[PDB]
Structure formats: C-alpha cells, structure tokens
C-alpha cells in the first residue's frame, strides 16, 4: 500500500515469471507433490495466509458526492452566497417584515431551488459510470478440480491456494494462472489476452517469449477448448496476469471530457465579471450613502443579473439531444459529454481483430484454372462470386466440401449463412461456409458422395484425405480427396485440372502456381492445397477394402485441383470509413496483439497504411536495415512489434509515435495498448479507442472516448467504453465525429445568445447606482429570461444545421481554439449586449415618459414611509400614487423592459443562428427555433397579462406601443452583425472583424 505511481502504475512492466524451470525446481519452489497433490492441512494453512482466489471490486458506492457537485456546480457558488445573502435580507427587517416578507424570502427560496435544479442537469451529465471489475471477477469459474493429498476433489475457485495442482478439461475456465506440468492434446483459447481467437496448445515443457507465449502456462481468464491438463497455480486472483489488468482497467481513471472541460474555462470567465463588478459596487458605491439592506439588495441583484441561470441546464439538453439523435442510428451512448469529444477527437486507436476485421476466417481467394479469384470477403454484400462456371471449380467445390468435418448447430433458419454456427474450426468452417454462398448445401453434398474411409486432419505429416463413392455411375466408382499444406499437396500430384481437362503437371504451371502461392501469401492469408483422385476400377472393384491408418491406395500422381486462401477480412464499412477519418485529418493507429504480418497486411487493406513501408525499402534498394535506410526515415510508416516497445522510453515512443504515420504496433500486451494511448495523449491530443475484446479494457479507459463493439465485444470491453456501436457498423465513428463537431458550434451559438441578454440585465442595477434612477429591471424579473424566456431558443439553436463541409477541417485543437473566448464575449457582451441594453433602457423612459417623464428629472430616492409628501413634474403621487408611484415600474417599466428584452432577443436568436452566413443564402428553416421564437414571444405576453400571478410579477402594458418600444432596436441588431458576417466574407482573411470573428 504505497503511492499511485505504484498502486496503479506498476503495469508499465509485464514479465517476472518462473515456468522456465525444471519440474524439480518447480516442485521445490512450491514444495508440492506433483501428482499426489497438496496436503489439505497445508491448503488452508496457505489460504488463511495468502487470501482467497478472487477479485475485489473497488471501494465505491457513493450516490451523493457526485449529486452534491452543485456545491461548486456551475455558478451555484454565487447563487448560494447570493440566496443566503438575499436570505438575510428578509431578516434585517424592522416594523413587521412588510412586503419585504414576500420579496427576498421568496427570491431566496427561488434562487435556492434553482441551484438544486441546476444540479440535476449538472448531474444527469455524468450518470453513475463504473463497474469493470464487475465482469472480470465474473469471468473466474465457480468450481475447480484440483488434486490434493491423493484424490481429485472439486471446490470453490476462491479456495485455490498458490502451490497446488489442478486439472482442466476442455470447456472449463482456467481456475488461476498455472504452469502445466503435463497435458494431453490441450488447447486453450487466449482471446482475452492475445485478442486472437484461434486455439493455442499446452505442452508441459517448452519455453519461448518467456512468459505469455510459452506453451506451458495457462492464464486466469482463458479457458480450455479441448484436451486436458494439470498444472500448478503460480498466481492467485488479484496477483495473476488478468488480475493485474482486472485491477488496472478498473482503479484507473480517464479525467476531463474535453467538452466538459470547456464547461470550465468559461464558467470561470463569466464568474470573473461575476464579482469584478459584483463586489466592486458593493464597495465603490455602498459607501455609507445607501443603507446596508440597500447594498445587499443591490448585491443579490447583480448576482442574479450575471449567472446565466438557464444555460448549463441548456447545454445539458444540447447534449441530451445529439445523443438521443445518434442512438436512433444506434451507437448508443452511456456518457453524454462523450458525444462532443468524439468531435474534438484527434487520434483513433483500434483493435484490428474484432473491430476493424470481423473476426471470422473467410475464403479470400482461390487459384482455380491457373488464374486468381476473389470473393465476397464481406458480410454478404457486393463483389458477387468469382465465376462458378468452369467445371474445374465444380471439382474444387466438392473437395473443400467433402474433405471437411464441419457442420452447423440448431436449425438456423436465419439466412445468415455467414453468421451461422460453426463446429469444427476456422480454417475448415471457413470453407464449409464458402460452400453455401453457392453450390447448394454441403450437408446434402456430404451425403451425395458417401464417405467410406478418412485419414484424420494433418497428423504432423501434413494433408488430410478421405475416399467417398461417386454416384455418377460412369467414371470411377471411388473418389478420394485430400488437402493440406499448399507446398506438400502440389509436390505429390502429377496432373491438374483446366476447365475440365487434365493436362499433366510440369514446369510451365508449377510456376504460375508458386506465383499464386507467394502472391497470395503476401496478402497474409493462409493457403491450402486441394486435390483429388479417381481410383481406377480394374484396380478397385466396388466393396474394395481400404485400410484406414494403413498404406493401401495411391497417394502420389494425384490430381491437383486448386488453391484456397482464407483470412480475417475487414468489416464492410471499415475500408473507407477509415479514409473518411483521414479526410478529417484524424490520425489513426492499429493497436493489436495479433502478429506483424497480419497486422500490416490488414493495415494496408483498410487505408491505415498507403505507400512507404520502412523495413521494405530496406530490400527494395540498399539491401540493408541501417545504412542509407533507418536514419533517412525515408519511410512515412512502420510496424512496431511489442517485443521492442517493451524496451522503449517515454521519449523513445514519442519519436516513433510522432515522426511518421505508421498507424500500427503489433503483438501488444494490454498494458501496451494503454502505454501507447498515454503516449499519444501526453502529446496534448484527444484520442479515441475502438475495441472488442477484454484485452482492450485498459486502453478503453485512459482513452478520452472509448468505443466498444456491441456484439463483437466482451461483456466488459463495453462496460469500459463510452460508446457502444450496436450494429458494429464502424462507420458510425464518422457519423459521430460529425454529429459531435456539429454540437461544438451549435453550442456556441446556443450559448453566446443565451447570455448576450446578460448585459441588458446587469446595466439596470449598475446605472441604478450611478444615478438613483429607479430600478428599471427587477431581480424577480431577471429570473424569468434566461431561466424562463430564452429557454427554448437556446435549446432550439442546437437543432440548427451545418454551415460547411465540416469533415474538411483539421481536428479542433484543444489548447487554442476554445469554446468561449474574447471572440465570443467581445461580440456578445461588449457589442450586442450593449445595443440591447439601450433598447430596454430606452423603453424604460417611454414607460415613464407617457406617465411622468423625467428625461432630465427622475434621479431620486423614492421612499415609501413618507407617502405622497413629494413628487415630480406637476403631480401629487402618494399613498394613491405611491402604492402607485412604483406601479410604473413594478407592474410597468420592469414589464415593458422585460418585453423589450424579449423583443431584442428575436434578432439575437437569428444573428446567432448563423456564424458566418447571411440568413439569406443560409437556411432559415429551423422549424424548432421558429416555433419557439413564438413560444417565447407569446409566453412573454402571457407573463405580461397573466390575470393574477401578475401580482408576484409585472402588469398589463399598452399592447399598441408598450411593446414596439425596443422594436426599433431589435432591427439594428439584425442589421449590424449581418453586415460583419458579409464583412467577414468580402475580406476572407479578415481584419479587425475576423480578428474578432467569433
């Protein structure tokens, strides 16, 4: 129990193992009889010492500390310091808290609830996101078969101590990490470690890449697929290899979601002026020239007139939408903010197998007729067949079909011939399936030609054959067929097909053959040799006795029919969907535990790599590695084997990582995927990781945004990811980077506006001090614009569509190009915020003018204990026009000002609708906005004539003009920025205007 650079940073290493030691040494190390087992007494003696074989979820179950975020949440600080300060107002009262009983106390509880509610949105933005170890610890088996003091007994995996030997049958999960001391035909599936699916085998002895690749170790998560074995627990639970990971890909934390970290840099700037004035006036004004209760009522105002009550709660919605928008196209989202990170994304990291490729051995090509062929390497799509004409294939067809042990399980009615259930193995089922796209059903073809004898698949001696009886009662009555290593097969024939004929083998074709071979091997697909023979009759009469595992019938001078290559093909989309991410300047990289050859050949296959392999020019010229090669780095890309990444330093990676666009590290340990991701991140970037298997877990966390794979993924890989493609359509990454980039913009617009109206809300109280000209705008009135009026329009902005070929610009850097900034503030606080100001300030006067205008008068403290005693401009305003002297601002002015703000907010909510295009040669079809712009303007009126609540609010203004006042202004607005946009344009590079573009 030390620091973190150790408790969760001790995985930058991998090795440290003893399995490359004599059974004697082993036995001695654990002091355990390698066959009688271990003593039960000794058993517990160790469990009560070492501690149960099982994982333990991280200490976490807090459902508050996260809810209670608002206690800093957004602007809830000032709100709290405000609604507490304005909760004091109702206190500092004397002669029976008069009307101030209604006000203050209420504005305190109101601003009070606000904070609370402004939190639920500053909460639903980060739904309880956790539970990895969950699945991991749910991957260990329940029972376990281990040998002790003699017999073999079964018990709870948890009870397996280090040191004893356990037996594992095929189809069970390996109890713990163990070094097999003996086995028989054991084959374990290492998916969850290598990431590859083809079964590996287990030998009691051996050695190799000392720990992970030696055939004498079995791993924690993995499971036995066939055969049997007995080994000795070298590591238990939390201490295993998958334990180290299970722990790592759990206790590790990502951090700040870009978009969500932008919800910071501005929350500060706004909260910067939040006091620069806020307190400034409390001081530079409240100079004992106003009563305490005055300053404070003035304090709690600017507060309210500053924190955009309705805004964060807005972005929340702006997110919620672009989420509930992508989900209709699948690629579900578990964490909102992610949505706008996928757009800020600069680099993508992908698990080749399962993600890019579909992970299913499929026939890639064929060499029937001295000519190459390609097939629908897809998930049933275009390309369509290779031919299917030439009788030659006809033959090859059956071969692959008969010389096969494959089948299907349930009835599988679903036509997904390719998505159906296999039995045998990749190599073979790959073939079976291939012979179902066409040539009817093999099951029937298997019964067409009945099998009488078969020589088991490759038995070290390469090849596999079987003799069936031909029903075509004309030519031979016995057809034997075999396939095996391409080399072997060929070099044991004497004649090969051609459309149907049988020209003899020789030098001529033995060439085009080698070509096809090496020419196919190059693409990195496995190739098999197919051939058959018709055993002559006068040599084998019906009923002839063939001796199974014994020489008896021909083997040489057979007929070579063809070549077939299979591979793990790229998904349908993957091909160009990658290019699209490039179209968008996004860098990619292949992080795979599979082997080099494959990784590269597959990299080239999906654009990940174009022209300029390093180690190739090494041969394509100055036949060497160092020399005029290495240094020159004349190579734009390269393939890095994990074996070497293990011996590299921080900067060493940096170099390799950012000195060329290799896009491919192969054979990598889980940790490595992450250490790789980290390295990408440490260079100030936003990286996303796409995976499927559990080996990704880690990298699917340190990664800014993580993309699982729905079905092609582990019931964990997903638990660690942010996005869950449920159609595995790897193109959604693009239909996600776009939709994300959209909301970045469609948020500024949505935000700029949502606060420009902040100005028209402060100024009143500010002037309200410089020249005691009666509260133009009311506090209880402010909480009714950002949190009541501009609501739907802020939201609306979000729906606003594009503005250009977005996927044409480099990823938005994250250190410079921010969200909120001068460009914005200047153009929304110091420009329009002002013009709006006048407007509603102007209306303030007219609202008094046509009643008792003091364009030169006014400027005076309007007490209320006096009652009548004074007035202005030929009047007697008192108890009658005192209750009333304010009815010109309360029920009025505030109201007309109020409406005027709305009224200016129209042209705002249209000048911010676009960021660079005249609403003219630009869609003005935001159905939502529009029907809201009215749903706003209207509420306004209902809130201005609402027969009752108008008490706790304003009053009946003179419809004919108590509205149009600001109207003269809304225009200038619209007219103003409209020119600049057109200004920004005529002069593209722009000057002061584009310099203060936005």
């Amino acid at each position: 129990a030390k620091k973190e650079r150790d408790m969760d940073e001790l995985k930058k290493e991998v090795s440290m193992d003893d399995h490359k030691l004599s059974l004697d040494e082993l036995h001695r190390k654990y002091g355990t009889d390698l066959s009688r087992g271990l003593t039960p007494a000794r058993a517990a003696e160790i469990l009560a010492r070492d501690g149960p074989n099982a994982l333990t979820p991280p200490p976490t179950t807090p459902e508050w500390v996260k809810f209670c975020r608002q206690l800093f949440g957004g602007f809830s600080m000032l709100l709290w310091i405000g609604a507490i300060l304005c909760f004091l107002a109702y206190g500092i009262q004397a002669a029976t808290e008069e009307e101030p009983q209604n006000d203050n106390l209420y504005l305190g509880v109101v601003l009070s609830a606000v904070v609370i509610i402004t939190g639920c949105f500053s909460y639903y933005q980060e739904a309880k996101s956790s539970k990895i170890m969950e699945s991991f610890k749910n991957m260990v088996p329940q029972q376990a078969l281990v040998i002790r003091n003699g017999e073999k007994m079964s018990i709870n995996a948890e009870e397996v101590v280090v040191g004893d030997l356990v037996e594992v049958k095929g189809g069970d999960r390996i109890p713990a990490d163990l070094r097999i001391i003996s086995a028989n035909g054991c084959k374990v599936d290492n998916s969850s470690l290598t990431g590859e699916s083809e079964p590996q085998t287990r030998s009691p002895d051996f050695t190799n890449e000392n720990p992970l690749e030696t055939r004498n170790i079995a791993f924690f998560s993995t499971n036995c697929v066939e055969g049997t074995a007995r080994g000795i627990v070298v590591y238990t639970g939390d201490r295993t290899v998958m334990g180290r990971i299970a722990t790592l890909a759990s206790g590790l934390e990502g951090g700040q979601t870009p978009i969500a970290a932008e919800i910071e840099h501005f929350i500060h700037i706004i909260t910067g002026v939040a006091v620069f004035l806020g307190v400034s006036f409390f001081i530079l004004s409240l100079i004992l020239e106003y009563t305490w209760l005055e300053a404070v009522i003035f304090l709690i105002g600017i507060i309210v007139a500053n924190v955009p009550e309705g805004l964060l709660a807005t972005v929340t919605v702006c997110l919620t939408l672009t989420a509930k928008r992508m989900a209709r196209k699948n690629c579900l989202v578990k964490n909102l903010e992610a949505v706008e990170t996928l757009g800020s994304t600069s680099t993508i990291c992908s698990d080749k197998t399962g993600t890019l490729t579909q992970n299913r051995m499929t026939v890639a090509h064929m060499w029937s007729d001295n000519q190459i062929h390609e097939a629908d390497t897809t998930e049933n799509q275009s390309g369509v067949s290779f031919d299917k004409t030439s009788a030659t294939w006809l033959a090859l067809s059956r071969i692959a079909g008969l010389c096969n042990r494959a089948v299907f399980q349930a009835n599988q009615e679903n036509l997904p011939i390719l998505k159906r259930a296999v039995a045998g193995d990749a190599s073979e089922s790959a073939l079976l399936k291939c012979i179902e796209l066409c040539c009817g059903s093999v099951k029937e073809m298997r019964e067409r030609y009945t099998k009488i004898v078969e020589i088991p698949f490759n038995s070290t001696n390469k090849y596999q054959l079987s003799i069936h009886k031909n029903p075509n009662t004309a030519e031979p009555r016995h057809l034997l067929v075999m396939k095996g290593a391409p080399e072997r097969i060929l070099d044991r024939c004497s004649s090969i097909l051609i459309h149907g004929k049988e020209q003899p083998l020789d030098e001529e074709l033995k060439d085009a053959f080698q070509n096809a071979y090496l020419e196919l091997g190059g693409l990195g697909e496995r190739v098999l040799g197919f051939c058959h023979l018709f055993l002559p009759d006068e040599q084998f009469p019906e009923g002839f006795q063939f001796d199974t595992d014994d020489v008896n019938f021909p083997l040489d001078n057979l007929c070579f029919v063809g070549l077939i290559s299979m591979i793990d093909p790229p998904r349908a989309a993957v091909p160009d969907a990658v290019g699209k991410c490039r179209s968008a300047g996004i860098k990619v990289i292949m992080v795979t535990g599979d082997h080099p050859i494959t990784a590269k050949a597959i990299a080239k296959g999906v654009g990940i790599i174009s022209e300029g392999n390093e180690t190739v020019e090494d041969i394509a010229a100055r036949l060497n590695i160092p020399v005029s090669q290495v240094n020159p780095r004349d190579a734009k890309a390269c393939v890095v084997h994990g074996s070497d990444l293990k011996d590299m330093t921080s900067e060493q990676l940096d170099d390799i990582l950012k000195y060329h666009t290799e896009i491919v590290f192969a054979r990598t340990s889980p940790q490595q995927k992450l250490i790789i991701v980290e390295g990408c991140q440490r260079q100030g970037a936003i990286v996303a990781v796409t995976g499927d298997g559990v080996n990704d877990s880690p990298a699917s966390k340190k990664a800014d945004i993580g993309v699982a794979m729905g079905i092609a993924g582990s019931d964990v890989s997903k638990q660690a990811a942010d996005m869950i493609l449920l159609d595995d359509n790897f193109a959604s990454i693009v239909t996600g980077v776009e939709e994300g980039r959209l909301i970045f913009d469609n948020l500024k617009k949505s935000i700029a506006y949502t606060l420009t109206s902040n100005i028209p809300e402060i100024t009143p109280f500010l002037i309200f001090i410089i020249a005691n000209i009666p509260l133009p705008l009311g506090t209880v009135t402010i909480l009714c614009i950002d949190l009541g009026t501009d609501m739907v329009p802020a939201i609306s902005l979000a729906y606003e569509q594009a503005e250009s070929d977005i996927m044409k610009r480099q990823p938005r850097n994250p250190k410079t190009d921010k969200l909120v900034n001068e460009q914005l503030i200047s153009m929304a606080y110091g420009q329009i915020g002002m013009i709006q100001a006048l407007g509603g300030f102007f209306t303030y006067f007219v609202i008094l003018a046509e009643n008792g205008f003091l364009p030169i008068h006014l400027l005076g403290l309007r007490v209320n204990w006096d009652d009548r005693w004074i007035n202005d401009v030929e009047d007697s305003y008192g108890q009658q026009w005192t209750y009333e002297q304010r009815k010109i601002v309360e029920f009025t002015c505030h109201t007309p000002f109020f409406v005027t703000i709305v009224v200016v907010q129209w042209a705002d909510l249209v000048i911010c609708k676009t960021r660079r295009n005249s609403v003219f040669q630009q869609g003005m079809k935001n159905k939502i906005l529009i029907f809201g712009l009215f749903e706003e303007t209207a509420l306004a009126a209902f809130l201005s004539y609402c027969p009752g609540m108008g008490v706790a609010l304003r009053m009946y203004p003179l419809k004919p003009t108590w509205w149009f006042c600001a109207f003269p202004y809304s225009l200038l607005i619209f007219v103003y920025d409209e020119v600049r946009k057109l200004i920004i344009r005529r002069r593209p590079g722009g000057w002061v205007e584009k310099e203060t573009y936005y």
Partner: protein, 46 residues
Amino acid sequence: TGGSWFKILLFYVIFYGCLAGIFIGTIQVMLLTISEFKPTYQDRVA
C-alpha cells in the same frame, strides 16, 4: 496580450460613440412627441 492592443480599443469607443448618440436621438425624437410640456395619463386618487 495582442500586437497593437490599441486599435481594438479605438474601434471600440467609436462604437459606444455612435451607440450613444443613437440612444440620444431615439430619446430626442422620443420627447418630440411626449406632448406640449408633458401630457399626463390614467391615474387618480381613491
């Protein structure tokens, strides 16, 4: 913090410049209609 941090301010007062007279005028022509010395509107004792 900005090359010629000055111009940005210059074409900033001119703004409040025009933005001001504009307030003036809208307020001028506003009065050019108030009335003859100041009208008076619907308010009475009770």
